[PDB]
């Protein structure tokens, strides 16, 4: 049976810890994939952590140079949420240096992008086998979400980008049923930049909060209807949530336009709450350290700076990284609404640390009816490792 | 289908060995979580060992300082009973430095407590996802059983404490159905202290034998009715079963009050047998070494010193630690009564031994219709380990 | 549904290789239990290798002194047939330094013997939990088959011994249904000695070929009826199949009495074939090296020396050890008869080799309609290991 | 339910990456079987990688001399496609130094060949147990496909060879139902040589492209009908696809006869496409380096040199090796045709490299409706390994 996912996102007062994998600490001795870009997505029966391996293990010579993003060895794999990305519990998914994945109620669909930068191929898998593909349409690192795609009533949606990472690119919405592409649209967004969308279902639509890697320190927003018409813009709130970013005091905000005039960025997320927004961000304005989430009153629909809740999940003495959105299936939560959850990637190694390698672990949080106290569920691994000596 | 668990506890003459995981011996070479606080609980299909990891492995540098109780890295995980807490067979449960877990016949409910000491959060999971929470109500290390909680006809019960570990604290009973809290009560117990309850079903009620960490060397007793009224007191028997404790000769006993005038303690258990009691305890009066279980005639209902059976499972030349109660589902035993079983934690490392780490393994015993001979199924690991050199 | 196992044993011309685990070779680097006494038994869905661990791993310091037979750390565990006894694929069964196990069509029954030599306890498990026990009845190392027990129409049978290993002991047949003992008998056998029976179903009865560790170099035979009456004696054939043994030329044979006047022995097996017998044995008369199986015409019912088939599975340049019998379920083979299969234990280390440890691997063979060529599927590990240096 | 597999092979424009196991890179630290001869085959539920172990692990002393082809330690095992051949995820299949395997819709059938060169035994397993055998009929290394066998409507077909590897041998087709041999035929092919067939279903027949290890640099072709009549010859195309081979310019081609006058070879594959052919081959004419696949117009039915598509999957700076064919079940793809897929073995170590060992990893590709860009998904391991120093 297909997951409906037509419900509204639950309104939440805070986020409770779901899981923590401790992958890099475990990987000091155990047999753990060197990874990055982990993310969580759920079937009616379980949630899983997906991750992009470097085709190599922590504390091994082959983990050298893994700060690098793309290689013929990178693969999309998965384990149960909270499990480390160890070899012996991992399910192979796809050959990928960029990925998205989601379940439609019947089977898992995964999308793994691999191949040369100038002519990359995205392979769509459904039920454990290749069923369709997408070739690069702009010849410049075809790529996608690095978090859960979104299935509503049996059709699954995701966002892809092809083109420059620092100027105007091209962006598309794809739609599949049972692993077969049944629709696609170009996203018109001149002056804007869309990368690494974090999406979720809400009121029968797909809402996405993404990454502007061009000029914006506020995040692009994309609301997708099943017919593939869309509304695109920026998260209205007068609070910048990208990294690097400027100070809140010096930021104005816009529903339509990038602001902040800074390059680069980091994958991040947001949840709509009626007209409010939960927005995640690193504590540091310049570095990928710390992680907090703010509820901005009316932040979804106007340039509001009215912060009504704030919760810290990783302190600023510790490394963070990417973050992304997913929802709990009604079949698992037992709710009449979609429980909003997020994950935080905690990057260790290069370029910040004294190692030959780069990897990451994850902490997972889910929205609840209560305020949750500030804490830090940081990575906690002790660097350098043996292989670095 | 919900497990009824309305039957009486089986009357038993002795305890047969169920399992032994050999985790620390195996962990000399294999990939085994550094743990403590293990415990067993059963679904209609299998029994599992739950444990609190230190988010690190035996014989690794990250096992340093693991004598410590609370950290952001500790997680509740589980394997099949008798299996070591190895990485590759473990199921993630919750983020936790204190935990309880039980099955209701349909799904597993787990409760993991993490967060800061002053404002800890307990997260209730059901079927593998967060479904509810409990915030600290007294701001002082919210905490719970460290053994199986108890499900009767679909509702699950457990005991939590919030407050000082060495003076008057606050104690509560919680009740859930399908991962959702449907009831709670404050336990009135001025002059008494309740920690780390070991519970089990008996005649449609939840019986608990707990730990007084304040003044008592006898164990608090809590009998919970489904409506959440309760009777609370001390295990009547004129035999002290906490550690540290005084000599039996110098102990009087009380059904209502703590006795012994000593601080500290250790998690322990007891089974009612009509009006008798099976009470477990360390052989040593001062240290966590050895383990024996005594059947005291009329020990549940009066200050009796009449020991009618005694069985040793770990000798006094060897380290023990915590111990806890669980029952075999009727669906597994095939009995018309609930088979009483217990587990013994065997702690190795600090503070007693010459290592940088603390962990433990477990032996599991189940009540039978026969007397069982004394023996010692001790941990058997050879310390120090390589990482200590 | 219960397995009937009322059919006749298939008549076979030879034995084809089923499996080989390579446990000790793999254990040079992988995480493998130090074991001995492995054996195979089958459910309607799969065959599994059971084994007695030493609660320690190959190439680890804790594998020291594992030539020893009994300890509090030994456990019965299992994996799929052909898999090594690695940690990460193993299912815990029982605490045991002696064991038997078999499936009744619905669930696995296992019997693990542990405890002190003078008062050992056998624990019967069914469906993964303790359901019954047997206490030592003669106070001298209660012990059992070390191979598959035998289930016919839902009732399971096995043979146990209690008493001296080198003089007259006591021997019993046990019968269980669903993990509960429903019958037992003393085996009258003055002058004879029964150890480590290898049994199988045949024509609605349990046939066993065992080990005389007292005076006999021929093997005791036990035919058990469901009502627990029995016939007991020695395998008639004028060929001795125990180890150590004398030369064939100097052996007479007897259906009723031990012959050969030598102490010690080794677990071995035999299959009835009408009135013929397949008998396994080490090639060496004195040492546990090599393995061959002979079909002796009329060897089951008379002192025949007429060898009609001979097949070698391990050459005499290589170490062997125990061997045992099991049958393929009709539900798996698709036959109208019970396929006879055997396993051979290949012991490495002490006392023959230059190591601190003793372990073993296994090769598994199943009867077919064809002659199979001689070969040697020996252990192949290269000793000493690192831990021995 | 039996898989029909009566459909036509899908016509494909290119091949998308399915999987990559990274076994040898992972094996630098993890616990990975030393293997060779991997291959993929699919049930209605999943595809699996089968492989022949050396009964030893990467980076262990026992991996020494593994350039060798046949030993008593080699076993057929399997994991999920894309997973490394690690110990802890592997399912035992058969004792084998040559193998084939396929699923009939109900259960897996495997065929493992082991024993002495002069009298080898092939054991057929079905549903996890031995059900039948084939003894050497020509006394000279009985052997088979090293890729998926082929099941059509419940009957499974494969090709075996017995005899010289460099002159006229003997070749047979076998047919089984539910693990039982129900038919066989001798293949008449004087002047020709058939090894290591790569087969697949097409229009209710079994098509095979094989290896001539005698004189031919073009590949033998075998089309098998269910009644076991056959047509045998050579892949017509005027392009040689064996290794070693001569230049394309100097090759003529033949539907009936070997051409090229060179010894040796390598396992390879081909897919019929109407009258066209997809033929795989190493880029190098002399060495097992690189891998490309050519679509030759009318290449199946005439000596055509008309190359209409070309796709590279491993560049000529990198080691390749064997390659083989399989199809996606309709039950998995959702197609009305059989999706053609292939795997490429990437051999590392001896004789080309500076190690004591030989192993390999694999990349898997499946036919799609699109052209796929050239790339190289090479092994990527860094040699020598620690054990080589
Ligand atoms: C800006 C998104 C993308 C453009 C190619 O680059 C990602 C940058 C990045 C990061 O840590 O900021 C990590 C990713 N692995 C990059 N993605 C790819 C497909 O190379
Ligand atoms: C006395 C119970 C509890 C109060 C916070 O402390 C436990 C003491 C303990 C022990 O070995 O006696 C081990 C536990 N890990 C402690 N529990 C917590 C939640 O810190
Ligand atoms: C003779 C059977 C038994 C009597 C206690 O001893 C077994 C001897 C043995 C061997 O290799 O010959 C190995 C077993 N582990 C012994 N069994 C026990 C229960 O100690
Ligand atoms: C030519 C096929 C076969 C004849 C015995 O030899 C195979 C050669 C080979 C190779 O890499 O070319 C590898 C295989 N393991 C060989 N097969 C066997 C059964 O020895
Ligand atoms: C031994 C080895 O391969 N070292 C390389 C180093 O030379 C290279 O410059 C770096 C990439 O940036 O990656 C390491 O893996
Ligand atoms: C290298 C390292 O981290 N060593 C620390 C030690 O300095 C610290 O005092 C102790 C905690 O008590 O824990 C060890 O882990
Ligand atoms: C370091 C250690 O424990 N060595 C012991 C050795 O002293 C003992 O004599 C032998 C048993 O026979 O077993 C080894 O394990
Ligand atoms: C220590 C050892 O066994 N070394 C052997 C070597 O002597 C032998 O010549 C070679 C086979 O070719 O295989 C290695 O395994
Ligand atoms: Ca930006
Ligand atoms: Ca106390
Ligand atoms: Ca004897
Ligand atoms: Ca050739």
Residue numbers in the entry:
A (entry chain A), B (entry chain A), C (entry chain A), D (entry chain A): 83 to 169, 169A, 170 to 306, 308 to 330, 330A, 330B, 332 to 333, 335 to 342, ...
What's the paper's own text on this?
Inhibition of this process prevents the release of nascent virions from the surface of the cell, reducing the spread of the infection. While complexes of N8:4 and N8:5 interact in a manner similar to previous NA inhibitors, the structures of N8:6–8 indicate novel binding modes employing contacts with residues within the 150-loop and cavity.
The parental compound within this class is the Oseltamivir isomer 4, in which the cyclohexene double bond has been moved to the C2–C3 position. In both N8:4 and N8:5 complexes, the inhibitors bound in a position and orientation very similar to that observed previously in structures of N8:1. In particular, N8:4 overlays almost exactly with N8:1, with only a subtle repositioning of the C7 atom due to the change in position of the double bond in the cyclohexene ring relative to 1. Surprisingly, given the lower activity of compound 4 in in vitro inhibition assays, no further significant differences in the position of the compound's pendant groups or active site residues were observed. Comparison with N8:4 indicates that these direct hydrogen bonds replace a looser network of water-mediated interactions, with retention of only the direct contact between the amino group of 4 and E119. The structures of the N8:4 and N8:5 complexes are remarkably similar to N8:1, suggesting that the reduced susceptibility of these compounds is not due to substantial changes to the position of the compounds within the active site. While the inhibition of 4 against the H274Y virus was poor (ED50 > 500 μM), the concentration of 5 required was approximately 10-fold higher than for wild-type virus (ED50 = 34 μM compared to ED50 = 3.9 μM).
